[PDB]
Design a protein around this ligand. Structure first.
Ligand SMILES: *C(=O)[C@@H](NC(=O)Cc1ccccc1)[C@@H]1N[C@@H](C(=O)O)C(C)(C)S1
Length: 414
């Protein structure tokens, strides 16, 4: 079977990232041009390091008594190739934006869930497998989403008709909720302000009240309608994002969960805990009139004849919030970037909307998050980013990175 030629893995814009080369021996050596590009996505079949990506998720596609003879094991056959949805140019954009940081970025089409760029850092080359990096931080690492999760809280509060963007909230520096103390960043007392402004400035005190008003059943149900609990990806592996069993939640737990911090202590997992990919699916469903799409990364499969054997169809995971709700959420996210905590994602000449977040992790470090879309009117791309601080002060980086990736990718599209 080592005399059987495996198919190629190609990008949407025709860049071959994996291919088989017949050696004088007869056997084929798996080669990888542009080694280092989209490593986690392209993947590998390694005794030592395991399996990952397309090499393994499309393994069988890539892989008479003519069958006995090893000498004819090639004349008879060749494996079918896989054309990804990844666009090599957008992929380089994301990879360059991650240089010198650990974290990840996903760029997707909101109307279909097609993943156009997917990158994790640090990365590696296939050549190195011959000798942290291996974790795919887009899909197989979980993180506290922090305030990026407030997009869900907000969408739920509006969709259930429990609040509006102009409804005022008290946003004090600290407040006591269910026996515990919720606090705004730097205990900033913002006074009484509309929900749009609490969202823009990312007040934990205000969003925690929305959380408590919604209740645990509503917060979980809406998180799940956005994809939590699903192994996202029609043709790639994502670890499901997690929420607790609502019945086990406490009011304080619910308060922080509504701001993206998981503090639960119970049999079911603490939440929320998200993947970067799940964050993208939320941004996309909001940009997409509330319709959630199951992301995908294979466009089509080709026979060795350079012929189309199948094409992926975009598929919905359901409608998480109504169109009217999504339009209000989009307007709120535009405010974050225009006058709130996401001002760093602004790029002159383009209109960008999103939501930021920052979350403390182990050893006093923190992570920076950004989800968003562009252009504001008729969005054609969505971005999700995490920049892990790991000692460095990365406050605001997710948003700077997100806006720049969005703008560059839009130019690529033009
Ligand atoms: C949501 O992410 C909130 N984050 C925090 O309150 C905790 C935190 C942890 C480390 C450093 C700073 C804050 C609020 N939203 C973020 C954000 O939008 O990035 C703020 C930093 C604005 S506070």
């Amino acid at each position: 079977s080592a005399y059987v030629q495996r198919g190629a893995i190609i990008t949407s814009d025709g860049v071959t990232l994996a291919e088989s080369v017949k050696q004088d021996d007869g056997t084929y050596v798996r080669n990888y041009p542009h080694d280092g590009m989209a490593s986690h996505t392209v993947g590998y079949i390694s005794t030592q390091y395991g399996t990952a990506g397309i090499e393994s998720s499309m393994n069988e596609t890539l892989t008479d008594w003519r069958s006995a003879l090893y000498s004819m094991a090639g004349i008879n056959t060749t494996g079918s190739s896989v054309v990804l949805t990844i666009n090599s140019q957008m992929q380089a954009v994301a990879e360059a934006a991650l240089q010198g940081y650990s974290g990840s970025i996903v760029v997707m089409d909101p109307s279909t869930g097609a993943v156009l760029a997917k990158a994790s850092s640090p990365s590696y080359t296939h050549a190195e497998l011959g000798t942290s990096q291996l974790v795919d931080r887009t899909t197989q690492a979980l993180y506290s989403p922090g305030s990026s999760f407030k997009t869900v809280t907000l969408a739920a509060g509006i969709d259930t008709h429990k609040t509006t963007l102009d409804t005022t909230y008290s946003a004090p520096g600290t407040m006591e909720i269910g026996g515990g103390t919720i606090h705004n960043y730097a205990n900033e007392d913002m006074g009484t302000i509309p929900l749009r402004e609490a969202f823009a400035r990312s007040s934990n005190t205000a969003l925690a009240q929305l959380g408590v008003a919604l209740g645990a059943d509503n917060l979980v149900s809406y998180a799940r309608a956005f994809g939590y609990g699903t192994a996202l990806g029609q043709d790639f592996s994502t670890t499901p994002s997690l929420m607790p069993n609502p019945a086990e939640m406490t009011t304080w737990e619910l308060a922080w969960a509504s701001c993206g911090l998981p503090v639960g202590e119970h049999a079911s997992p603490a939440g929320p805990q998200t993947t970067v990919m799940q964050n993208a699916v939320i941004a996309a469903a909001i940009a997409n009139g509330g319709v959630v799409m199951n992301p995908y990364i294979v466009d089509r499969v080709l026979s060795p004849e350079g012929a189309v054997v199948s094409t992926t169809s975009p598929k919905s995971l359901g409608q998480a919030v109504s169109a009217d709700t999504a339009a209000q959420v989009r307007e709120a996210m535009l405010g974050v970037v225009e006058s709130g905590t996401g001002m760093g994602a602004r790029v002159p000449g383009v209109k960008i909307a999103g939501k930021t977040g920052t979350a403390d992790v182990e050893n006093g470090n923190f992570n920076s998050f950004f989800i968003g879309f562009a252009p504001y009117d008729h969005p054609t791309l969505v971005v999700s980013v995490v920049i892990e601080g790991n000692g460095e002060n990365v406050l605001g980086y997710g948003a700077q990175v997100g806006g720049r990736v969005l703008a560059q990718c839009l130019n690529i599209q033009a």
